[PDB]
Write a protein that binds this ligand. Structure first.
Ligand SMILES: CO[C@H]1O[C@H](CO)[C@@H](O)[C@H](O)[C@@H]1O
Ligand SMILES: CO[C@H]1O[C@H](CO)[C@@H](O)[C@H](O)[C@@H]1O
Ligand SMILES: CO[C@H]1O[C@H](CO)[C@@H](O)[C@H](O)[C@@H]1O
Ligand SMILES: CO[C@H]1O[C@H](CO)[C@@H](O)[C@H](O)[C@@H]1O
Ligand SMILES: [Ca+2]
Ligand SMILES: [Ca+2]
Ligand SMILES: [Ca+2]
Ligand SMILES: [Ca+2]
Ligand SMILES: [Mn+2]
Ligand SMILES: [Mn+2]
Ligand SMILES: [Mn+2]
Ligand SMILES: [Mn+2]
Lengths: 233, 231, 232, 232
């Protein structure tokens, strides 16, 4: 399979596969069964912000998700990505729907990678997305251009979300995420998102992920699997 | 479609070169739209800085060594009317009958588009054996001393003739957009040109091309890995 | 006294001092009489953006001022700042009112300076606090109201007052040029909200560069924008 | 008196006041007696690099010090700087000598601060000039010799002197924390050259954060690194 490290914004509790009984943020290493989670007070139809950070000194992957004028949710997990990910990776955003549905709208996405061996750096910032965005690899139902936004999951003419949808956006360039002879390595990711649902049951969520360069949507990764994992193991 | 800043070490007066080593701005042709005398220093590490913005619509380059007057060239051009909106950016070099090392020690690029801000930045101060965010073309290699060698160097360390190589950044770049208020880019690279007995050739270029750009047939020597012909 | 280089957003035409007959953007070298101007379609009560750029290669100071979904105004002037300003300067924003009045609200301000010879300075304000210790506030300028920088006096009710001058300078001196320097560049960006009760807004906002010890010159209210002692 | 948070590169073991028995890197909160230390293989006459990081999410201050082609030294400490430092601070480098001596040469220094409630401050020195107006020099600190910052006294002949203290602070105050901030982070880097004539180099270099009005405390030469009034 693909090797995946994700921060998930999980809107639908699947207690079947280890989810808590509420909307949560999670850190996923090689599995959809989060190594650490925190309660998330998801606000239907409000624009939220996700900030992910990691460095080779603390070897600690941390995420904060927040809305304006509300307490933020925060999750951290000690992990050396040197022992998990290959040296060269792609970074992306993933989303899915199942029986239940939500818009998975990305309004902005920025990423910074620094590697001191002589510092090498990569930085991109999207505050709008265009009709033909050639520095993104779009996978599944993901599209760009509607209101200058990235729609990870299928939305009908009227703006209504559809079920059984999976989409991903990967940045075109591979990223040197770690190196054997490296003194300090760090990365930071930010994205803004709008999750809107018709009912009280939004599903299934958004993830920032890091994968092998040649990563694709695994067969039947709709719903609970977030476009990231082939199975629930 | 090519827009290049050339560091031209060999005068080819046949195709419009001045009679000295020069820096040049090339729009769609090897016959520079503007040039300036360049006091190229064999075996010293030099620096090139390229800048452009959609307000002044002026492409400028400065090339310098420590403790020496810099050489500077500028050209008014709207790149909105020249390049496609999505491009790749790279470094190119060549040798012909005459030869030089075309060593790149560092390379950075910044692009910004503010609409009515989107940004891309890369910085290489070192190059690795398997650099997956570069497309190497022709004789270009990475890993020797943590450097990018654009043209072929023998085991013994000697540069070879009839060599062409290029390095392109893997990701396409949004270089212009109609609905943009301000669009700008900046590129910097450090280079080491060393020639066996003097008489060096043929030079290094920073370029911007269509995404699918490759080394054109017979672009060794005077054509710098950039042009199919001398028109 | 002070050596001033400014980009002015001039809302009130003072044709007596060289001004065109419309709201304009201008480049001011050592004088309030703009060396180059352009018509500015100023929009009362909408948030606008100004972007100022300069580099030692082109030796050209350029400004663009725009609102969303409107054509931008642009002004440029060839000048070598090596021959005008000292090598160490302060950077700031200035605003004034006279008989006529407007809010001179700054919502954001960023500045970047690079000198290769690379030494660099960058600051970004997307909000201003009640006690902003990396700004020198001069005259009527205050911070804290809605996280904004009010360059000119505003009453409790939000109503602008006349005969007001205020400036905000960044605390640190900036190395703007150096004798043995290969490339020098700077960029400034600011967001502003100009609102007037009547059809006669005055007097405008300026991004400026001055000697480190620069202060509001006596009687630089109204047309002089808090920048100049006289109209020469 | 002054509130100090420091990363020390300590070249001289003062076991009397809690130092380990070897050259070490340390994190100092309000005291010279390091809250965490790590063995440092200090290399006389080689250019080294120091990298300091902190963010309000992990609330963990971390430092790495390295030379080319050598294993790095690393030290980390959980601390909420919200409960230690005032909201507004100055940042600097400090060094000292006592009976024993070393050059305390700074070749480069950069700092970045970001506060999302985004406000940002960034400086980079790869050169220091004769009259560097965005630095406050204190004690024996000077700039201009080889484009370097010499924190401690060096004689004409190039020889380091004992009983020397010097500091360099960035001129602008820094908003290091704010209550209603979602994420706050800072990063500092410097390159240094420590050279000693004998086998007893002393006393070391520190990156520090202090109250804005911070000065060299009375009798802070040698083991106290120009940072602390006493050894408590
Ligand atoms: C019946 O369950 C389906 O719908 C839920 C809610 O969308 C998903 O979590 C799950 O994977 C299935 O696709
Ligand atoms: C005789 O000319 C040859 O050599 C020069 C210098 O190398 C090149 O410019 C040219 O393309 C030819 O290959
Ligand atoms: C009558 O003119 C006054 O008012 C205008 C408009 O405010 C100013 O330009 C000028 O300096 C005076 O103060
Ligand atoms: C004998 O101790 C002296 O010298 C050492 C080493 O320089 C310092 O640590 C100390 O403060 C004293 O000045
Ligand atoms: Ca779930
Ligand atoms: Ca030629
Ligand atoms: Ca006027
Ligand atoms: Ca000690
Ligand atoms: Mn989950
Ligand atoms: Mn030529
Ligand atoms: Mn005017
Ligand atoms: Mn100690």
């Amino acid at each position: 399979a693909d090797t995946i490290v994700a921060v998930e914004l999980d809107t639908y509790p699947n207690t079947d596969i280890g989810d808590p009984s509420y909307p949560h943020i999670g850190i996923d290493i090689k599995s959809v069964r989060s190594k650490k989670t925190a309660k998330w007070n998801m606000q239907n139809g409000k624009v939220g912000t996700a900030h992910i950070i990691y460095n080779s000194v603390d070897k600690r992957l941390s995420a904060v998700v927040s809305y304006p004028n509300a307490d933020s949710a925060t999750v951290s997990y000690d992990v050396d990505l040197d022992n998990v990910l290959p040296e060269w990776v792609r970074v992306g955003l993933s989303a899915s729907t199942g029986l239940y549905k939500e818009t998975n709208t990305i309004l902005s996405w920025s990423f910074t990678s620094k590697l001191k061996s002589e510092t090498n750096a990569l930085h991109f910032m999207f505050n709008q997305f265009s009709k033909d965005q050639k520095d993104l690899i779009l996978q599944g139902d993901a599209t760009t251009g509607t209101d200058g936004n990235l729609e990870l999951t299928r939305v009908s003419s009227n703006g209504s979300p559809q079920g059984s949808s999976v989409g991903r956006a990967l940045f075109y360039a591979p990223v040197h995420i770690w190196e054997s002879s490296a003194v300090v390595a760090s990365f930071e990711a930010t994205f803004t998102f709008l999750i809107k649902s018709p009912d009280s049951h939004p599903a299934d969520g958004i993830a920032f992920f890091i994968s092998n360069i040649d990563s694709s949507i695994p067969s039947g990764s709709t719903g609970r699997l977030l476009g990231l994992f082939p199975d629930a193991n």
